[PDB]
Amino acid sequence: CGVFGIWGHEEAPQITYYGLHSLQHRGQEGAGIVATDGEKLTAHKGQGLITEVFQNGELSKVKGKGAIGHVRYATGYENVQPLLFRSQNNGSLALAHNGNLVNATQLKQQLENQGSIFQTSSDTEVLAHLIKRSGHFTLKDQIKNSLSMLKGAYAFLIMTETEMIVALDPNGLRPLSIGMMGDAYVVASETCAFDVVGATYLREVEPGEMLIINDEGMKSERFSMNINRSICSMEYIYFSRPDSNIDGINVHSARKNLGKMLAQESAVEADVVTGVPDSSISAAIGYAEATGIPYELGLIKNRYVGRTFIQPSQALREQGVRMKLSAVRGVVEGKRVVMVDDSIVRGTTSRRIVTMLREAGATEVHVKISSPPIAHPCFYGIDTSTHEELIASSHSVEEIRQEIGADTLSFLSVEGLLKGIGRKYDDSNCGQCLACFTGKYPTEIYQDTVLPHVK
Amino acid sequence: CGVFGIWGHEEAPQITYYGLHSLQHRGQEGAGIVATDGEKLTAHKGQGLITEVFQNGELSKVKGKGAIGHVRYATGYENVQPLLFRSQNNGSLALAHNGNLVNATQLKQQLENQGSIFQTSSDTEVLAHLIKRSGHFTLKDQIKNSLSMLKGAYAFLIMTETEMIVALDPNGLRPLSIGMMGDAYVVASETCAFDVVGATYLREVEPGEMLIINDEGMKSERFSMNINRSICSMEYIYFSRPDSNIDGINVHSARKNLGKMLAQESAVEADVVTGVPDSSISAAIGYAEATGIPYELGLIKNRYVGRTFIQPSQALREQGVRMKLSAVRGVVEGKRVVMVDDSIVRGTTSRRIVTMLREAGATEVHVKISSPPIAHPCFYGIDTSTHEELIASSHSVEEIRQEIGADTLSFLSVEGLLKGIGRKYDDSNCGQCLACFTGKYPTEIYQDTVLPHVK
Amino acid sequence: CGVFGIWGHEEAPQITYYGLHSLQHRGQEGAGIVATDGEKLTAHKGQGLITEVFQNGELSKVKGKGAIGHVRYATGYENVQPLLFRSQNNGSLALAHNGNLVNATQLKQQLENQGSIFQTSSDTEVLAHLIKRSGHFTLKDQIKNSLSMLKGAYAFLIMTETEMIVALDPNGLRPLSIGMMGDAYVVASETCAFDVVGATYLREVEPGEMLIINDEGMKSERFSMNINRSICSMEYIYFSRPDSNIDGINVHSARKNLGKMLAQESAVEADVVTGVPDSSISAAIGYAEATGIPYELGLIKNRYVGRTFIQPSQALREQGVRMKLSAVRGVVEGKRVVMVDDSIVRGTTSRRIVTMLREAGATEVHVKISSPPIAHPCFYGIDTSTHEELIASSHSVEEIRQEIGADTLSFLSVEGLLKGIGRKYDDSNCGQCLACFTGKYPTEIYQDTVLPHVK
Amino acid sequence: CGVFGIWGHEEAPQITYYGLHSLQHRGQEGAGIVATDGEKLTAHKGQGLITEVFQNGELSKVKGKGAIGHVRYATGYENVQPLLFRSQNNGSLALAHNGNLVNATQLKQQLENQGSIFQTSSDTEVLAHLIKRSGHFTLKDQIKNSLSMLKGAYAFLIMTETEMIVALDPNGLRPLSIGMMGDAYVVASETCAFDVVGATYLREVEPGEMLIINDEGMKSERFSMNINRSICSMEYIYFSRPDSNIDGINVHSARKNLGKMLAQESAVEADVVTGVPDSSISAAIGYAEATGIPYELGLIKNRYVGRTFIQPSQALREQGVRMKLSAVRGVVEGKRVVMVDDSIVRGTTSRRIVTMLREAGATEVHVKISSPPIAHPCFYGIDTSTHEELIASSHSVEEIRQEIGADTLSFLSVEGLLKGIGRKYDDSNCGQCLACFTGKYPTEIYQDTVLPHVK
Ligand SMILES: Nc1ncnc2c1ncn2[C@@H]1O[C@H](COP(=O)(O)OP(=O)(O)O)[C@@H](O)[C@H]1O
Ligand SMILES: Nc1ncnc2c1ncn2[C@@H]1O[C@H](COP(=O)(O)OP(=O)(O)O)[C@@H](O)[C@H]1O
Ligand SMILES: Nc1ncnc2c1ncn2[C@@H]1O[C@H](COP(=O)(O)OP(=O)(O)O)[C@@H](O)[C@H]1O
Ligand SMILES: Nc1ncnc2c1ncn2[C@@H]1O[C@H](COP(=O)(O)OP(=O)(O)O)[C@@H](O)[C@H]1O
Ligand SMILES: Nc1nc2c(ncn2[C@@H]2O[C@H](COP(=O)(O)O)[C@@H](O)[C@H]2O)c(=O)[nH]1
């Protein structure tokens, strides 16, 4: 999921459309914008892409000087964010979340026992309920208080008629950054949103920090003095857009260095290096460049394989009909190929890619993954978690190489990964979460905790 | 436009969906399939993408053992091909064209003076009328006769209840190839269609050749003994998909060598090489690889900028809101950049790209084009032609350079182009049309001839 | 089908929208408007209702000072009229037909043997082909000549850049009338269109007459000196809108008199008179009024049973789920009911209505039909013809009574019908066609002649 | 709004579709069904008509043995009912309301001060919140308790996995009735739903009664011992379907007697009586029948003037383009006309109708309304309330006549209204609410009370 907010701009909702658009890759299962003129909050949101949602429901209707918007990844319209709430006497509150609350089950029951009704399936709503059923005089304080009860990953955009309030979990598991458009303030899951809308980078939101932005500026305030830096590794490996800089480190560049690292760890002798569009192009470029083997487009992703697309019958696929990707035998025929991918999860893609490549007449396929094996669940986002079984969880690397049918299989080591990304922080893992590789989670996982999809 | 036919396959219409899908890049302004069981011809076709056309109108309805399908590029439903015609006594005829008939105006008047009514704007219809108002006993012959009266570029798919008939203009200006799916025969504008559906390459259809395919096989027959090989250069430079092999030469590989050629002609000293997604990625890879400068993603194309997408107000764009592309300052900031593009037409894109790149903090932009300047009209397809004025037609490489704002600007020479593609044919231009560069057209252009868009 | 044209009005296409709208009942299977400014012809047309076609495709795009429009009844977007044809040297022609050409098969072959290609399934196209392949210098003359070769029912609207041309078959089987909007001329299948758009009635187009309307006025010209008046009876009984006056006789009033006639022929003793909405409301009002029995709404038609509507499973219908109509037991329970309907065709509706009425607790059902039995095919329109078998064609009135389950069944006699409508022409059937009752067709029916649906 | 529930039927959701369909006239601004198999509650709902909602979202998905459905009138998807609520431990609750809670503002603040979040704008949600934040052990009791805190009009359908619970406000302002389908129980706003789905009438739900229906039957329980019968008069005059029997009195028959009453109060000498389709057809029939003047269709409502329909420019309307209705001059030309309408609100319709009728050449128009003037707000439904100003509130009868331009204007007296409906309940107004005529409301209207639209 991706979130974008901006405060202090005539066309805040348009900017949000564009910002949110640049984050559209974060998920395409819904989208929404809520905007404020100072008096009223306007809002349109729906399922599907941002474009399926607007000009299928007018962007003109939503008007304001501040807005927050959310792009939802999904595994019901009630769940499409931002969530907006109105009240008789106390005005309005819109909220948008990226992450996952690892104690949400707990809190829902407590809040339900206190008499809260839940209408969505979102964590964002839980935050809404804590805020309401909170003692403090001010919202700033209701929020600070509520935040400190949440466990897990969360980047939160919240706004009312008069302010925008931004908060990041004290591990800073998800990225969140701040930018300037003149005097406007902009806040986005990824920096690419800034590039796209004309915003200048300012800095990251600090884990455990909270920003209150309004017509007289921005103020920062802690809500968790002790912080334990562990940003999601997959943001770097896979999930963010390559033009984004996570913490000033560019995602393309990082992923390319992950390729150089792979080349230094497990070089093999070969004729062409291909990436997989679009997950592992930057790794592949980096790998080829390190080894001296030429980078080729040995695999093509069909640009138009949306949800509209009719799946070939399984019998057709046996026949050889491709769906999303195919191997270019124009390029690989008679070559021995290094196929670089960002990661392996189920293993199903790499097996398929190895098979197509051989069916295009590659003589060797050497699969090289720019991540350590993925053997543990994620609990910090629906986007990053999965219900699918993990191959790395039960198969050794060699057991895996046999399953995908590669000639060789190589994963980046953890040091390689950490070294490749080049993150500066002082501890044995550079302020990154590595839970899904190592099994060592940066927050406690309770026994009532459900997997993000399980909601 | 792109055309796909297959004869001898239970699921000919499904295969055509998938084949046509792989050619979807050829144009998205309409699409259609016509299929035959041996008795009746079924057909669904509409405007928009293949997916907007199917599951918006059922693919299940169209059933057969042969089908031909067309994907239309455009600058009205009546014009979406294939064109299907029925008759009381003489059964049916479906026709699909890719190319442009440089004498269509002439023929229309003659056929109109003979009492033909025209209901579409397509060249395909002209062929239908010549066939009908033709003397010969058989269709094969009516077609051969009709064909010989056409001037220009044309790949034709034609079919009836009982046969499929394929024909290519005797210059072979557009590609057309044949493949096998078991015993089925398959014919497509590009080979990538074969890759995608499980077809094996057989050969190209010969310029001036005509194929008749039916339940007992395929037969070839000339309709123009003297042929003059001049395949569209842009198919190689720009227009085909990179996994396609035009005449056994792979389009990715070719375009990459065009990069190597650029590097040998006009190397400059720089820090990063970027392509433009997706037009000039392969050129860029090749250029970087030749020069030793690192390949980076210094430009990103937003994946979701469909026709649904709301254009930023011109005032917003002045503000810095991007549409389709943006420059990654995460990558270029402080670097001197070689920006490789396939071609320049209006010049408007390259100017923009140069500006964004400088706004992302690139210190130098060196624009290097993997084509000779484009200074003459195309007359051999709506896809390849344009109503926009050509910058290269009135500006020296210098006045252009100044106009896009590049530090340097370099076009591939013609020899470089010919050498890069590396066609082996014996004549001064390797069996390629270079008309839009050189002004020397491979067919005669009459005075009544309209530009392809003018229809 | 219904046709509307107007010449000499800034907003001719809007007027046509509205005119066509008032004729929407004529059929809902497509619709189109073609308009001219004097230079170019603009045109939008599609399948479905006029509103599904406009604001699903803009009315703003079609602009002009004359337009013709068509509303199509159906049992292909190629078939939606008007048909528009363009040419290199000779400008444009749009044509719209209401009726059916009883020799169309003949003509198509002849025109096909002369080398015409047919792209639609419409009669309108045949006229287009005769006009083109016609010897005379002027269009007026080409049309007159072409017309005289047509056999059957036809009201034609035709127009070019400069004129509108209107023609009615020399039997005047379909209505067609002329009106004035200021200085504009208006032509419509039904007069209700005039009421709706602010047009004044002028007169009927004479059977075998042809109008040429242009910027200097209207001129009349015969194309068949000998005429034989036989207007479709169903236009009066059923098919036209009740606010329309066919030949100055109002359709409501006529149908009501048909009710008075029924009352004079076969009065029965009963408690309530119900019509069937909406086919036989006026008849029912008239019947009740004659007999003195009270008019009630003993049947209700659900206003929202469009094509979107999910048909109840046949098992549900056995359970008692209704679709379009139901009987009001609030009104009929314990009463003996006269149920008046305009006509019987298959018989399936009257049986159902009799059953529902008995299930609402009516003690008697007396079915009284304001038309003679329908025992012969129609050949003069798809609207008026049917592929369904005619009950009256094989069943005596008695049998039909037994089949619908009525207590009594009564059809209007032919004299009653003729007397009720009240037309004053001097011949044994008052200038009406009674073919589907009597079997005596007012034009010759050839052996190659297909039923209007068979196309 | 209209509500339909049925318990104990394999196809409960289909039946609900059909039942809801028959209540579609109640409003077309949304629709929804929730169904239960005993374990899970399934639900589809959306904006627009029932058919726009289903087969645009599958009815097959929603399955069960009980269901409740709602059809919403509106002047958001969040507001489309039924409202469905789920919980971790306590299962599910769906609720649907028809009516309006005249103290909802009060209760929302109280519930908001107790920490409730409100996500819809509906009264239905308020009931949901009272139920949750209620002390009692059982739901039956939580509801009874919650109900007793509501002020205003309310018919409520509520259901869970195991039961259906129905309740009517102790004034019985909205109709609600019970029927049988074999052993199934059916509950609907109007009886016409029963007719349509094959249900037998059982009785009305008693004002202040509550039904609990489950797999072992139905049980009744009061929640307000003292009841004060005042059913909405407009249900009879206008709002219900003519085949519905409100409290055993048929709505057609009643409205017809309202015509007889009008005829007895203010007969005038005239030539034809027309109603207005479809609001005042039954009144008109009754009037004509009383006076002996013939009933004619002097006005026609265009059947296809949906929300899709393009409104004629105001300039066109000045020209004489009609929208929904037009006058039949075929019928009224030269006649003096009694135009009977159910009611007058703004007065805008009657003025228009009088004008069209004169433009069709009626010599006199005598407007006769089958309701007392409407001079006071409604507070008991969005359907029945309006934001438009009431003409009768500031204009004397004779001042309205001048405004609509009638020759004469006549309202039914209150006695006439009461007498016509035939009602005899032992009080001065027969158990009907007459608030919008008299100003004497049957419940107290608080100072915080907003007009139903104001939400
Ligand atoms: N506009 C864009 N340009 C380039 N890369 C992008 C863009 N948007 C997202 N991405 C990248 O796409 C990658 C995944 O692409 P995709 O092929 O859809 O993934 P996968 O094949 O694994 O399902 C991500 O790792 C991300 O960096
Ligand atoms: N599925 C695909 N994968 C990669 N490249 C593709 C694909 N389909 C088409 N192309 C390529 O895209 C290029 C043009 O992409 P695009 O960015 O849309 O062009 P442009 O930016 O010039 O308008 C073509 O030169 C073609 O080779
Ligand atoms: N706007 C209208 N108002 C009243 N009657 C109309 C209107 N439009 C068409 N009609 C009438 O509707 C009748 C048929 O209505 P419908 O119930 O659809 O026919 P059927 O039930 O036989 O299929 C026609 O006989 C025609 O006169
Ligand atoms: N299927 C139906 N058949 C007949 N009358 C109906 C039907 N459904 C609703 N009605 C009636 O329609 C009347 C209003 O019709 P309409 O013309 O839409 O109202 P109005 O013109 O006042 O806006 C109501 O008074 C109601 O009794
Ligand atoms: N790690 C990861 N990879 C993903 C995700 N979604 C798609 N992918 C892609 O899926 C690949 C592995 O797919 P799998 O092995 O499960 O078939 C990775 O290369 C990556 O490109 C996700 O959420 N996480």
Ligand SMILES: Nc1nc2c(ncn2[C@@H]2O[C@H](COP(=O)(O)O)[C@@H](O)[C@H]2O)c(=O)[nH]1
């Ligand atoms: N030559 C050519 N380039 C095209 C066409 N359509 C899009 N392009 C793209 O447009 C670029 C030049 O755009 P322009 O200079 O006209 O603004 C080329 O790099 C190519 O990527 C086309 O039909 N022909």
Ligand SMILES: Nc1nc2c(ncn2[C@@H]2O[C@H](COP(=O)(O)O)[C@@H](O)[C@H]2O)c(=O)[nH]1
């Ligand atoms: N005569 C006739 N009736 C039609 C037509 N379309 C619908 N109807 C209706 O169908 C009724 C008879 O239906 P059927 O007996 O075929 O079931 C007539 O009352 C009329 O209301 C048509 O084209 N012709």
Ligand SMILES: Nc1nc2c(ncn2[C@@H]2O[C@H](COP(=O)(O)O)[C@@H](O)[C@H]2O)c(=O)[nH]1
């Ligand atoms: N009383 C009433 N009439 C309504 C309503 N909606 C539509 N109408 C119609 O509107 C007519 C009066 O329209 P008006 O005078 O406001 O222009 C009544 O005859 C009735 O047919 C409603 O909610 N209440």
Ligand code: SF4
């Ligand atoms: S477990 Fe893996 S995917 Fe999840 S936050 Fe940590 S690094 Fe990211």
Ligand code: SF4
């Ligand atoms: S046969 Fe019957 S339906 Fe046909 S034109 Fe004659 S009267 Fe009309």
Ligand SMILES: [Mg+2]
């Ligand atoms: Mg990948």
Ligand SMILES: [Mg+2]
């Ligand atoms: Mg390019």
Ligand SMILES: [Mg+2]
């Ligand atoms: Mg009828």
Ligand SMILES: [Mg+2]
């Ligand atoms: Mg009314």
